[PDB]
Amino acid sequence: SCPSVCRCDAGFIYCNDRSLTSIPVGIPEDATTLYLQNNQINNVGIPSDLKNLLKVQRIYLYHNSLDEFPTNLPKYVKELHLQENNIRTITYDSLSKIPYLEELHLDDNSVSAVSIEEGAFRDSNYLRLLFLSRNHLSTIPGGLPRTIEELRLDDNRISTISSPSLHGLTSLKRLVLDGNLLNNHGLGDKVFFNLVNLTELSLVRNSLTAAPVNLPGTSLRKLYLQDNHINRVPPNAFSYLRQLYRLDMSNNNLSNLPQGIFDDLDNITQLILRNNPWYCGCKMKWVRDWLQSLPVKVNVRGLMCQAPEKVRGMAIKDLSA
Amino acid sequence: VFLCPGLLKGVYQSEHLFESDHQSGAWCKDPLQASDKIYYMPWTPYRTDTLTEYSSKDDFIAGRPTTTYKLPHRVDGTGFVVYDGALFFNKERTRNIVKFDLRTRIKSGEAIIANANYHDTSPYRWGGKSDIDLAVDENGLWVIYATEQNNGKIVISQLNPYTLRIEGTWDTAYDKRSASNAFMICGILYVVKSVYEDNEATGNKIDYIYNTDQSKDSLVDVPFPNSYQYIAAVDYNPRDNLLYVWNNYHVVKYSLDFGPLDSRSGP
Numbered sequence A: 001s002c003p004s005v006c007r008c009d010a011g012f013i014y015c016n017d018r019s020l021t022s023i024p025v026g027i028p029e030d031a032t033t034l035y036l037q038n039n040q041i042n043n044v045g046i047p048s049d050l051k052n053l054l055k056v057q058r059i060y061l062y063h064n065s066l067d068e069f070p071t072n073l074p075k076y077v078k079e080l081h082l083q084e085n086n087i088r089t090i091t092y093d094s095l096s097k098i099p100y101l102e103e104l105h106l107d108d109n110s111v112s113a114v115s116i117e118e119g120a121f122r123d124s125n126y127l128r129l130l131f132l133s134r135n136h137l138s139t140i141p142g143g144l145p146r147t148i149e150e151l152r153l154d155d156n157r158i159s160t161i162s163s164p165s166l167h168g169l170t171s172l173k174r175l176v177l178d179g180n181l182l183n184n185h186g187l188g189d190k191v192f193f194n195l196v197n198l199t200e201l202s203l204v205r206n207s208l209t210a211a212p213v214n215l216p217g218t219s220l221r222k223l224y225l226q227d228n229h230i231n232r233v234p235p236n237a238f239s240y241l242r243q244l245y246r247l248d249m250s251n252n253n254l255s256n257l258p259q260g261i262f263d264d265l266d267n268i269t270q271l272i273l274r275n276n277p278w279y280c281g282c283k284m285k286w287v288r289d290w291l292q293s294l295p296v297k298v299n300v301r302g303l304m305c306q307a308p309e310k311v312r313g314m315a316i317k318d319l320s321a
Numbered sequence B: 001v002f003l004c005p006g007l008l009k010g011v012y013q014s015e016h017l018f019e020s021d022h023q024s025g026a027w028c029k030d031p032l033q034a035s036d037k038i039y040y041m042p043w044t045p046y047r048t049d050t051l052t053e054y055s056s057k058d059d060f061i062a063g064r065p066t067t068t069y070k071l072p073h074r075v076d077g078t079g080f081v082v083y084d085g086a087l088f089f090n091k092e093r094t095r096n097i098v099k100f101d102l103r104t105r106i107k108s109g110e111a112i113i114a115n116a117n118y119h120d121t122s123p124y125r126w127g128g129k130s131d132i133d134l135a136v137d138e139n140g141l142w143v144i145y146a147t148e149q150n151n152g153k154i155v156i157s158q159l160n161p162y163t164l165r166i167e168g169t170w171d172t173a174y175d176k177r178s179a180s181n182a183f184m185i186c187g188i189l190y191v192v193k194s195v196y197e198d199n200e201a202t203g204n205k206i207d208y209i210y211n212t213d214q215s216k217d218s219l220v221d222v223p224f225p226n227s228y229q230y231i232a233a234v235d236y237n238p239r240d241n242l243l244y245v246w247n248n249y250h251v252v253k254y255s256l257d258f259g260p261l262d263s264r265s266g267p
């Protein structure tokens, strides 16, 4: 049943850190979870004997030596953990062998938008989450399948998002675009508008100079905007966004704040406006009245100027002729 | 350091705090801080990256938080502890323990737990990436994990809370996936067995104990409470001699009664 090298217990087959290339033939029929992490497993290592008699639903294959997307996997597998590898391409035939997949973890690889096959995720209308963090990516794939709820494209090299890339992904709950080359013109017109059941959008550490517009208000609870060169907030940026509970605006050079930008925000409870001083006084007279808001309780880690401190009295610090 | 209260014999639920919006997670205090602060990190698969801190139980119930600690990496499971102002936790998809200095917001260290199984490989009965459990007692810092040399069988380790280094490793002959949760008191492993959500009355008690000092281990039957049928995390405190249990959403404290501390030898 179980090999000399690999040892199993009640379905869970632990063939990890053993340091070998091929998957051992000694794979039991009543399989639950296939552990194959921290090994030397290459692309030829995976044999044909990994379907037809495999009851597996979760296969872990991180810290391995395989190139390309894995081939010959049990049809009813839901979790495909493929991390810290040199997977370049994701073809139709390779993905097609596992139709009932729920979670595809491609964190730390080399999958580019050019490297991913056109219409690979076509017959993949069962995927709940796809992680493509730190890959050779340049654009949001676009050929991405429906029923996706978690798409993490963080710490990549993605520069541009097109309108039909996220158009149709709607069912999506959380979009994580962190540490990327997304500029304001790099961020497509009315790009997120379409994503109705989106609870979380993360744009942390990018290249956008002004807080996005045409953002979903329909169901968006969180919006993470930090480590960007945001100076000007467009009036219609935080408009029709009622359902927003958390907004993060820290580590952003907001020199100004327009009169009644947060008006359309009602559910708002947590705000993070810290790490940007010298900004107070003129035009921000409304903040003094606003931050002192009606019930319920108030929570905001706001901003306050450095050179001035209290508008009361007269400055007269200018003494030159 | 801290004085040993004796051998644990009776576990009784004495305090009932609030109910979480998460079925799993961990909540604990710092036994080296004279302040009555509370640290709460609810489990959210692949999304656990923030530790919440509370000043009092009143604030902890009403959901009034003191501050939030965003962590430079994702956390795996409900293992975490808070010792001398620095939290220790299992960094996600690794066998590393990360010392993180709170109220300085800096990674002071990172300890590679040699040959440890991680990421739902050797977890508790409920899984949830609870492969490595940090532990604070009278003898200090601990790591309750498991190696595939043992193959599922729990492996405990003394861990320097200041230099983050393994100060000993003891192999136990009891499965981890069988364990619902485990903890340390006077360097003694108390391993909790409880029913979950076929789901027959397997048992609701600590059935095994391993003694670090002397390396001896025996079978027990210490009646452990599982009223909510899903034990998420159990963390002992040597300062107030209490268990800081999380159970199927229920955030609760479990009181202890201690008997005479005894150890027999014959190698």
Ligand SMILES: *[C@@H]1O[C@H](CO)[C@@H](O)[C@H](O)[C@H]1NC(C)=O
Pocket: A147, A170, A171, A197
């Ligand atoms: C949001 O949209 C998805 C689309 O598949 C739907 O299944 C879901 O019920 C909707 N509502 C919520 C609260 O997720």
Ligand SMILES: [Ca+2]
Pocket: B133, B134, B135, B182, B183, B184, B234, B235, B236
């Ligand atoms: Ca514990």
